[PDB]
Amino acid sequence: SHMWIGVISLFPEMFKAITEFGVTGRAVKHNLLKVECWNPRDFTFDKHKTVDDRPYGGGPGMLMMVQPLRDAIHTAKAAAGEGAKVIYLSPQGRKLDQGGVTELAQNQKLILVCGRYEGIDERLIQTEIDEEWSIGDYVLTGGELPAMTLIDAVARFIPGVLDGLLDCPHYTRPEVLEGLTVPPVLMSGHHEEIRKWRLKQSLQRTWLRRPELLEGLALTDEQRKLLKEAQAEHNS
Amino acid sequence: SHMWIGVISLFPEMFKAITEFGVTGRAVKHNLLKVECWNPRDFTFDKHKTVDDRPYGGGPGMLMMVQPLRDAIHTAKAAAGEGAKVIYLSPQGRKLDQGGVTELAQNQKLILVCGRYEGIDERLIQTEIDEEWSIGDYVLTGGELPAMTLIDAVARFIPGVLDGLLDCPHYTRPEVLEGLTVPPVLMSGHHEEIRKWRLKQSLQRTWLRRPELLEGLALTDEQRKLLKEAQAEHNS
Numbered sequence: 001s002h003m004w005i006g007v008i009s010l011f012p013e014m015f016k017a018i019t020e021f022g023v024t025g026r027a028v029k030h031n032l033l034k035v036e037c038w039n040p041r042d043f044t045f046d047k048h049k050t051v052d053d054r055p056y057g058g059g060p061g062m063l064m065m066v067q068p069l070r071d072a073i074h075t076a077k078a079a080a081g082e083g084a085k086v087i088y089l090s091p092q093g094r095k096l097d098q099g100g101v102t103e104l105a106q107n108q109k110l111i112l113v114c115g116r117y118e119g120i121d122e123r124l125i126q127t128e129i130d131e132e133w134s135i136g137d138y139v140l141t142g143g144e145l146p147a148m149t150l151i152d153a154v155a156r157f158i159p160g161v162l163d164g165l166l167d168c169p170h171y172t173r174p175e176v177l178e179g180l181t182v183p184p185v186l187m188s189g190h191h192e193e194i195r196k197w198r199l200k201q202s203l204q205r206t207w208l209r210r211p212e213l214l215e216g217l218a219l220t221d222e223q224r225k226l227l228k229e230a231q232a233e234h235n236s
Numbered sequence: 237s238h239m240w241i242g243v244i245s246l247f248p249e250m251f252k253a254i255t256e257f258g259v260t261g262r263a264v265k266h267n268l269l270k271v272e273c274w275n276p277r278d279f280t281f282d283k284h285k286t287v288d289d290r291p292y293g294g295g296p297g298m299l300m301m302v303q304p305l306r307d308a309i310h311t312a313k314a315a316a317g318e319g320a321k322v323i324y325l326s327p328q329g330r331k332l333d334q335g336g337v338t339e340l341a342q343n344q345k346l347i348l349v350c351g352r353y354e355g356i357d358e359r360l361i362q363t364e365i366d367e368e369w370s371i372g373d374y375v376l377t378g379g380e381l382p383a384m385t386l387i388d389a390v391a392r393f394i395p396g397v398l399d400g401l402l403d404c405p406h407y408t409r410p411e412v413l414e415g416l417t418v419p420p421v422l423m424s425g426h427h428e429e430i431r432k433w434r435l436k437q438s439l440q441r442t443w444l445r446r447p448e449l450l451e452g453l454a455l456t457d458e459q460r461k462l463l464k465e466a467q468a469e470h471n472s
């Protein structure tokens with residue numbers, strides 16, 4: 001299932017970071033992921049290609065100018081055809097988590113609008129945007145890194161591109177590293193013991209680092225047992 | 237206060253997205269922010285510049301090879317000199333928020349280690365890493381976008397580069413947009429009424445979208461009043 005993502009950004013060249021490198025770069029080269037960018041600067045008509053404008057009511061900051069942004073969005077929507085969801089990345093949006101990534105990945109077409117300055121006119125959110133999303137409770141200089149982050153996350157769900165708990169520890173060569181050894185179970189070749197060890201480690205690490213994540217899970221019988229074991233060993 | 241950030245990454249060219257564009261690009265050109273990258277591939281000695289290795293205990297994935305990564309980290313630490321904090325970006329890390337960004341921004345030097353494949357040997361976390369951080373509860377193909385996100389966030393705190401509530405709505409030209417008008421208060425020129433309107437909007441939007449954020453604040457007398465007003469109007 002091909003995925004198409006339209007991007008609206010004053011800095012389209014930033015997106016080379018995902019389209020030219022790594023797993024996402026491969027997805028693009030192999031036509032599994034298409035990323036198409038429109039720059040509001042290209043939709044300006046004045047001599048200096050003005051893309052910002054003053055906020056009504058005053059204030060220190062600027063907003064994105066409505067007309068070039070609106071025209072870029074409309075062009076992206078035309079190219080997308082039917083069924084594209086338009087996403088605005090902002091701190092006031094729905095907070096992204098893996099469940100949310102899974103939801104967004106169900107779309108074959110997305111348009112991502114990247115805000116700069118103090119953001120965009122509220123009426124454009126009403127008239128052009130379908131959903132607002134945040135990548136976390138922190139503040140950035142633009143919506144491009146959030147857009148790139150979202151693209152990377154949803155790209156993992158495209159066929160051919162590649163449980164709620166934190167990952168277990170992993171080990172590779174050498175057998176001894178600054179005096180630290182590899183857990184003997186991992187060298188035992190006993191697949192079941194190894195699986196159970198990894199699962200128990202994941203449960204232990206989730207409990208110690210992010211206990212609230214556990215509360216949101218319905219643990220299996222096996223997970224309940226291994227978690228109890230890990231907690232017992234912790235209190236020993 | 238200059239900030240220096242060392243980066244360890246198999247894809248250093250991704251960081252052009254922050255060093256060549258926008259506010260962070262300006263910070264770099266003006267020597268307010270320095271971003272220096274080391275690529276583990278450059279620290280390999282075999283003919284094919286191998287940077288991955290097999291996990292003990294088996295499994296579908298690979299890990300970053302220890303020796304080239306360790307040598308890159310040591311080189312970065314040497315260049316940083318005294319006082320650099322080494323950060324590993326991973327989903328099992330402390331979840332980043334703006335308070336956390338503020339904490340990390342207090343450092344004049346940071347080294348950011350970007351994991352690929354299934355991540356890095358656990359013993360390297362013990363021996364080389366000071367802190368693990370996550371940019372959110374979702375899964376990406378590498379630590380580069382998280383590293384870039386962190387750089388952008390902390391760069392906003394560097395002098396010369398540029399309250400817990402969501403932002404108010406903002407408006408710019410035109411006065412009427414698809415029939416939608418600008419709130420008359422914003423056209424009134426009454427600075428105090430405008431300030432109070434913006435604050436009330438911020439409180440209202442935070443309450444409606446992210447009520448848990450409010451619980452973590454000690455609201456001022458004025459904020460308590462405007463929030464009560466907004467809630468009263470909502471229930472009217």
Ligand SMILES: CN1CCN(c2ccccc2CNc2ccc(C(N)=O)cn2)CC1
Nearest residue numbers: 089090091115118119134135136140142143
């Ligand atoms: C000082 N303000 C500048 C403009 N801004 C803003 C506002 C609206 C849209 C885009 C931006 C660009 N910034 C972003 C974007 C997303 C995130 C996220 N968490 O997903 C963090 N930051 C908010 C901050």
Ligand SMILES: CN1CCN(c2ccccc2CNc2ccc(C(N)=O)cn2)CC1
Nearest residue numbers: 325326327351354355370371372376378379
């Ligand atoms: C399937 N695994 C591949 C390897 N991995 C991993 C593990 C450890 C370090 C880096 C990575 C790179 N991925 C990241 C990194 C950070 C975040 C974040 N939320 O800050 C999300 N993803 C976890 C997922």
